[PDB]
Enzyme design. Structure first.
Site, PDB file in Angstrom:
ATOM      1  N   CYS A 274      23.649 -62.107 -75.252  1.00  7.37           N
ATOM      2  CA  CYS A 274      23.158 -60.807 -74.876  1.00  7.37           C
ATOM      3  C   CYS A 274      21.694 -60.564 -75.278  1.00  7.37           C
ATOM      4  O   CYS A 274      21.347 -60.548 -76.475  1.00  7.37           O
ATOM      5  CB  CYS A 274      24.030 -59.698 -75.480  1.00  7.37           C
ATOM      6  SG  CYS A 274      23.456 -58.052 -74.965  1.00  7.37           S
TER       7      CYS A 274
ATOM      8  N   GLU B 179      19.872 -59.817 -63.017  1.00  9.89           N
ATOM      9  CA  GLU B 179      21.303 -60.092 -62.857  1.00  9.89           C
ATOM     10  C   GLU B 179      21.704 -59.806 -61.416  1.00  9.89           C
ATOM     11  O   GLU B 179      22.503 -60.575 -60.822  1.00  9.89           O
ATOM     12  CB  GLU B 179      22.142 -59.205 -63.781  1.00  9.89           C
ATOM     13  CG  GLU B 179      21.973 -59.440 -65.267  1.00  9.89           C
ATOM     14  CD  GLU B 179      22.855 -58.486 -66.049  1.00  9.89           C
ATOM     15  OE1 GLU B 179      24.113 -58.714 -66.090  1.00  9.89           O
ATOM     16  OE2 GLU B 179      22.290 -57.495 -66.581  1.00  9.89           O
TER      17      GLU B 179
HETATM   18  C1  HEM Z   1      22.528 -51.838 -73.256  1.00  7.35           C
HETATM   19  C2  HEM Z   1      22.200 -52.503 -72.146  1.00  7.35           C
HETATM   20  C3  HEM Z   1      22.474 -54.010 -72.063  1.00  7.35           C
HETATM   21  C4  HEM Z   1      21.771 -54.928 -71.398  1.00  7.35           C
HETATM   22  C5  HEM Z   1      20.485 -54.706 -70.574  1.00  7.35           C
HETATM   23  C6  HEM Z   1      22.445 -56.214 -71.574  1.00  7.35           C
HETATM   24  C7  HEM Z   1      22.024 -57.404 -71.048  1.00  7.35           C
HETATM   25  C8  HEM Z   1      22.830 -58.501 -70.899  1.00  7.35           C
HETATM   26  C9  HEM Z   1      22.603 -59.601 -70.012  1.00  7.35           C
HETATM   27  C10 HEM Z   1      21.438 -59.696 -69.013  1.00  7.35           C
HETATM   28  C11 HEM Z   1      23.609 -60.483 -70.186  1.00  7.35           C
HETATM   29  C12 HEM Z   1      23.846 -61.825 -69.446  1.00  7.35           C
HETATM   30  C13 HEM Z   1      24.694 -61.481 -68.210  1.00  7.35           C
HETATM   31  C14 HEM Z   1      24.768 -62.573 -67.155  1.00  7.35           C
HETATM   32  O1  HEM Z   1      23.932 -63.522 -67.152  1.00  7.35           O
HETATM   33  O2  HEM Z   1      25.697 -62.480 -66.293  1.00  7.35           O
HETATM   34  C15 HEM Z   1      24.480 -59.971 -71.214  1.00  7.35           C
HETATM   35  C16 HEM Z   1      25.586 -60.600 -71.724  1.00  7.35           C
HETATM   36  C17 HEM Z   1      26.427 -60.080 -72.680  1.00  7.35           C
HETATM   37  N1  HEM Z   1      26.344 -58.828 -73.308  1.00  7.35           N
HETATM   38 FE1  HEM Z   1      24.854 -57.462 -72.976  1.00  7.35          FE
HETATM   39  N2  HEM Z   1      23.508 -56.045 -72.424  1.00  7.35           N
HETATM   40  C18 HEM Z   1      23.607 -54.679 -72.684  1.00  7.35           C
HETATM   41  C19 HEM Z   1      24.599 -54.050 -73.406  1.00  7.35           C
HETATM   42  C20 HEM Z   1      25.701 -54.696 -73.899  1.00  7.35           C
HETATM   43  C21 HEM Z   1      26.842 -54.057 -74.525  1.00  7.35           C
HETATM   44  C22 HEM Z   1      27.071 -52.526 -74.702  1.00  7.35           C
HETATM   45  C23 HEM Z   1      27.657 -55.033 -74.956  1.00  7.35           C
HETATM   46  C24 HEM Z   1      29.002 -54.893 -75.698  1.00  7.35           C
HETATM   47  C25 HEM Z   1      29.208 -53.876 -76.559  1.00  7.35           C
HETATM   48  C26 HEM Z   1      27.078 -56.294 -74.585  1.00  7.35           C
HETATM   49  C27 HEM Z   1      27.606 -57.514 -74.889  1.00  7.35           C
HETATM   50  C28 HEM Z   1      27.417 -58.652 -74.150  1.00  7.35           C
HETATM   51  C29 HEM Z   1      28.226 -59.868 -74.200  1.00  7.35           C
HETATM   52  C30 HEM Z   1      29.504 -60.188 -75.018  1.00  7.35           C
HETATM   53  C31 HEM Z   1      27.565 -60.795 -73.198  1.00  7.35           C
HETATM   54  C32 HEM Z   1      28.020 -62.186 -72.776  1.00  7.35           C
HETATM   55  C33 HEM Z   1      28.965 -61.911 -71.592  1.00  7.35           C
HETATM   56  C34 HEM Z   1      29.694 -63.150 -71.097  1.00  7.35           C
HETATM   57  O3  HEM Z   1      29.562 -64.276 -71.683  1.00  7.35           O
HETATM   58  O4  HEM Z   1      30.410 -63.014 -70.071  1.00  7.35           O
HETATM   59  N3  HEM Z   1      25.844 -56.072 -73.994  1.00  7.35           N
HETATM   60  N4  HEM Z   1      23.943 -58.798 -71.689  1.00  7.35           N
HETATM   61  C1  LIG Z   2      27.474 -54.936 -70.879  1.00 11.52           C
HETATM   62  C2  LIG Z   2      26.729 -55.721 -69.809  1.00 11.52           C
HETATM   63  C3  LIG Z   2      25.366 -55.555 -69.645  1.00 11.52           C
HETATM   64  C4  LIG Z   2      24.695 -56.277 -68.643  1.00 11.52           C
HETATM   65  N1  LIG Z   2      25.355 -57.137 -67.856  1.00 11.52           N
HETATM   66  C5  LIG Z   2      26.716 -57.318 -67.980  1.00 11.52           C
HETATM   67  C6  LIG Z   2      27.465 -58.253 -67.035  1.00 11.52           C
HETATM   68  C7  LIG Z   2      27.845 -59.632 -67.629  1.00 11.52           C
HETATM   69  C8  LIG Z   2      28.711 -60.445 -66.669  1.00 11.52           C
HETATM   70  C9  LIG Z   2      28.921 -61.870 -67.197  1.00 11.52           C
HETATM   71  C10 LIG Z   2      29.913 -62.673 -66.349  1.00 11.52           C
HETATM   72  O1  LIG Z   2      30.003 -64.049 -66.809  1.00 11.52           O
HETATM   73  C11 LIG Z   2      30.701 -64.987 -65.929  1.00 11.52           C
HETATM   74  C12 LIG Z   2      30.011 -65.059 -64.554  1.00 11.52           C
HETATM   75  N2  LIG Z   2      28.853 -65.898 -64.888  1.00 11.52           N
HETATM   76  C13 LIG Z   2      29.100 -66.750 -66.056  1.00 11.52           C
HETATM   77  C14 LIG Z   2      30.521 -66.372 -66.518  1.00 11.52           C
HETATM   78  C15 LIG Z   2      30.733 -66.447 -68.044  1.00 11.52           C
HETATM   79  C16 LIG Z   2      32.096 -65.847 -68.389  1.00 11.52           C
HETATM   80  C17 LIG Z   2      33.281 -66.602 -68.294  1.00 11.52           C
HETATM   81  C18 LIG Z   2      34.506 -65.979 -68.602  1.00 11.52           C
HETATM   82  C19 LIG Z   2      35.819 -66.738 -68.536  1.00 11.52           C
HETATM   83  C20 LIG Z   2      34.536 -64.643 -68.981  1.00 11.52           C
HETATM   84  C21 LIG Z   2      33.356 -63.939 -69.062  1.00 11.52           C
HETATM   85  N3  LIG Z   2      33.388 -62.633 -69.448  1.00 11.52           N
HETATM   86  N4  LIG Z   2      32.172 -64.546 -68.757  1.00 11.52           N
HETATM   87  C22 LIG Z   2      27.420 -56.612 -68.962  1.00 11.52           C
END
Ligand code: HEM
Ligand SMILES: Cc1ccnc(CCCCCO[C@H]2CNC[C@H]2Cc2cc(C)cc(N)n2)c1
Ligand code: HEM
Ligand SMILES: Cc1ccnc(CCCCCO[C@H]2CNC[C@H]2Cc2cc(C)cc(N)n2)c1
Ligand SMILES: C[C@H](O)[C@H](O)[C@H]1CNc2nc(N)[nH]c(=O)c2N1
Ligand SMILES: C[C@H](O)[C@H](O)[C@H]1CNc2nc(N)[nH]c(=O)c2N1
Ligand SMILES: [Zn+2]
Lengths: 405, 405
Positions: free
Chosen positions: B109, B286
């Site tokens: 993140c 994104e």
């Molecule tokens: C506040 C505005 C936020 C922005 C601009 C932001 C930005 C991002 C971005 C750009 C990604 C990568 C997404 C992708 O490539 O698909 C991401 C991933 C992530 N964010 Fe944030 N984030 C924000 C808030 C949050 C919040 C509120 C949480 C949880 C409380 C969070 C937790 C996570 C987690 C766990 C991931 C990895 C998701 C995954 O592996 O699927 N973020 N964030």
């Molecule tokens: C809170 C927040 C702020 C800004 N953007 C987001 C959206 C994050 C969406 C991430 C989705 O991730 C998916 C689709 N691309 C790699 C893949 C990684 C992954 C795999 C799996 C099994 C679950 C998961 N949550 N994420 C969430």
């Protein structure tokens, strides 16, 4: 047990089995990944013998003569030489094979589809900086080939237990001067400030331009480095202009044709070649994106944006992205116009995907450093962004080494 | 030097050491032999107790009552509860702290400068799929806030001894349908083919557009999941237009405002909240780079390049880079016009650098997954590209978990 590797665009999976051939540790542990670090922190007879054996084995396997008479007898020679002298020497064909393999094994190189096509100059009979200079000029001339660039490496004499190393002090064979100013700013390439100052201090008369080609500091063992000016006619340069933006040429920007790295150590079968400069051709993003747009390089983004009358006040107009694209386009356009070999980041990454596929079938794997393979603009627009990659060290290898001063 | 990873910023020349990594209790996928940092996917009485004790120590440090009577009494309370029941329960303020810490600890993140500002909706009283829907709707209303977006998480009951989990089947609260066509192509979002087909299996009457919002599939313990339509007035969307390319609006492209991940597991002190959807706001890349331009997503690059009249027959026209910039600009411009919070990749990565510096001072490091932090266009134009990063797993954490079907 062996990593499963997935391409996320196509849904295809392979298994890297080649990584089992690694005997050299990287920086990562199960507690933390350090794959994004540029350098490792890091910077005997029985052990040399085994690297030697393994490499000779690699060599006779490549020529399919594995197990033959010649193979046995070569293993005898290496052993006999090591047991008596503590070192040994490669045959020229072994050297050629080792050099190609080191490139093949290089995880940070996106150009590896070319790895089998490499002109190897054997400069192991070099005994002076003057001779080094002649070999280096021959390399430049060969490689440049009037714009039709050809990959090459020149290999100077290996390190020996007694003495100092042969070294080229310059990080590349072509480098533009970086003059530190009173007011702390830099004229020219900020990356080369230190080498520029070393050149001056060993007697070079400096110019005062943004693109002054540096002299070479060449070092024969246990001797002060010597200064050698490259004849301007050997250094092909490309004036940069833009297909549609007329004012771009008035930026007076330019870059050199020949990317030749000269500070890396080549390790083959336990032996180390501390001077072994190599060259191929540029991928445009190296010039267009990094060399010109990095804030700690020529830093031209703003200048270009203003010329484009872009809205500079706010990141959200994407002025940086727009200016970078045009600069990368100007590089491609200019190299094509000058008929000098270059490859764009789309064509390069597509060929690298082909390389990954070739290596899977040939060796069961390909060591690659995702952070270096994915280009510095438009990452996800290239197929390599979506490809998982395993990074590890195979030998023969190109390696970083300390600066000689 | 110190016996902790040294971490360098190559733009500024500054150096830090990461000491926070010592706190990692869980192994990632790397070994000395090979780096696997580019992989998207990774892979109890006595164990639980130590995880619990650790989290409680974290809580009491965070309030500066470390070693205090309340601290030792909470520890005792926790082990007694585990001793008679096999599990325990978080106090409300422990839950809020644990949720913020899981966000703070998330290596992927870039938005973590915002980590201290999270609205934590406690939904551990929820006892049916219908009530889950109410909670989720309230979350969506609160978080959306008519376009002035506010970060939020709703936490449903934790995993229990051989009793079934609360699960949201959808990977996000808002997802566009992806319909497999007779010819094998896909109408809508190809990412969502499987979930779309699950929705139809469970009685959803499908639409036939590129942007049909999916219903939610919600599962209370040991029950078949139940289907719920989001009232359209709750799902804020932004029609996409371009500031100067007037035809761009005619493409009918759009995206939803609220990015809300619903398939991740929130782990705190050994307890596992299998349904804990969280949301923030988008970074523009994104939508405009990945969701619209990935080949395996909406794949609109070619269509937009044709409208822009680019030469799509050759890589070296940079038609892909040019089209991607404009699509990204259209996303930014349209969100701005609609007054829906969004952040561009320059502003976001700048703020992530500030976050790195706050965390250096507060905790001695920050876990960060370089491949995920660097944006998918214009990589080296952002400051994070030049920043080395150390990746490791801290708890509390968000983790991936298997799909419930
Ligand atoms: C506040 C505005 C936020 C922005 C601009 C932001 C930005 C991002 C971005 C750009 C990604 C990568 C997404 C992708 O490539 O698909 C991401 C991933 C992530 N964010 Fe944030 N984030 C924000 C808030 C949050 C919040 C509120 C949480 C949880 C409380 C969070 C937790 C996570 C987690 C766990 C991931 C990895 C998701 C995954 O592996 O699927 N973020 N964030
Ligand atoms: C809170 C927040 C702020 C800004 N953007 C987001 C959206 C994050 C969406 C991430 C989705 O991730 C998916 C689709 N691309 C790699 C893949 C990684 C992954 C795999 C799996 C099994 C679950 C998961 N949550 N994420 C969430
Ligand atoms: C044939 C044309 C070639 C192209 C288009 C190419 C492409 C590239 C690129 C883009 C990089 C990263 C450069 C950077 O970011 O600064 C690189 C790195 C590298 N390449 Fe190549 N390459 C080519 C030929 C070669 C050859 C001939 C060799 C050696 C024989 C080689 C070995 C390496 C090594 C060792 C690196 C890492 C350099 C470092 O860590 O400083 N490549 N290549
Ligand atoms: C053969 C070929 C083909 C295309 N391009 C090239 C030029 C590669 C230049 C690589 C320079 O790398 C420098 C500057 N940025 C990271 C840093 C890595 C590095 C560090 C050290 C100590 C040595 C070295 N060679 N490389 C060479
Ligand atoms: C810190 C980070 O690892 C560093 O900026 C790397 C990122 N990726 C790179 N990739 C390439 N090809 N060349 C580079 O110099 C870098 N720099
Ligand atoms: C294979 C590679 O790990 C994968 O494509 C990653 C690269 N970086 C990413 N970075 C972010 N933020 N989001 C992603 O989905 C990905 N995908
Ligand atoms: Zn790693």
């Amino acid at each position: 047990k062996f990593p499963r590797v997935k391409n996320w665009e196509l849904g295809s999976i392979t298994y890297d089995t080649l990584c089992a051939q690694s005997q050299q540790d990287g920086p990562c542990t199960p507690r933390r990944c350090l794959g994004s670090l540029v350098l490792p922190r890091k910077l005997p007879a029985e052990q040399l013998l085994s690297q030697a054996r393994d490499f000779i084995n690699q060599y006779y396997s490549s020529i399919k003569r594995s197990g033959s008479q010649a193979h046995e007898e070569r293993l005898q020679e290496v052993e006999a030489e090591v047991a008596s002298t503590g070192t040994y020497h490669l045959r020229e064909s072994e050297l050629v094979f080792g050099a190609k393999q080191a490139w093949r094994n290089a995880p940070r190189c996106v150009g590896r589809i070319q790895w089998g096509k490499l002109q190897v100059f054997d400069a192991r009979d070099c005994s002076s900086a003057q001779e080094m200079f002649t070999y280096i000029c021959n390399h430049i001339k060969y490689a440049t080939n009037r714009g039709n660039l050809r990959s090459a490496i020149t290999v100077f004499p290996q390190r020996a237990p007694g003495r100092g190393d042969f070294r080229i002090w310059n990080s590349q064979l072509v480098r533009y001067a970086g003059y530190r100013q009173q007011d702390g700013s830099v004229r020219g390439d900020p990356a080369n400030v230190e080498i520029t100052e070393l050149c001056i201090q060993h007697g070079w008369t400096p110019g005062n331009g943004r693109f002054d080609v540096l002299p070479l500091l060449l070092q024969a063992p246990d001797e002060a480095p010597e200064l050698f000016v490259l004849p301007p006619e050997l250094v092909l340069e490309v004036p940069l202009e833009h297909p549609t933006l007329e004012w771009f040429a008035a930026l007076g920007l330019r870059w050199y044709a020949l990317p030749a790295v000269s500070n890396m150590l080549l390790e083959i079968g336990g032996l180390e070649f501390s001077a072994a400069p190599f060259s191929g051709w540029y991928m445009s993003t190296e010039i267009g994106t990094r060399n010109l747009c990095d804030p700690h390089r020529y830093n031209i983004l703003e200048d270009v944006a203003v010329c484009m009358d872009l809205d500079t006040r706010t990141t959200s107009s994407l002025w940086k992205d727009k200016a970078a694209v045009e600069i990368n386009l100007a590089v491609l356009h200019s190299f094509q116009l000058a008929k000098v070999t270059i490859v764009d980041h789309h064509a390069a990454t597509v060929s690298f995907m082909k390389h990954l596929d070739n290596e899977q079938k040939a060796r069961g794997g390909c060591p690659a450093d995702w952070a270096w393979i994915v280009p510095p603009i438009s990452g996800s627009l290239t197929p390599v962004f979506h490809q998982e990659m395993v990074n590890y060290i195979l030998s023969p290898a190109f390696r970083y080494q300390p600066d000689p001063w």
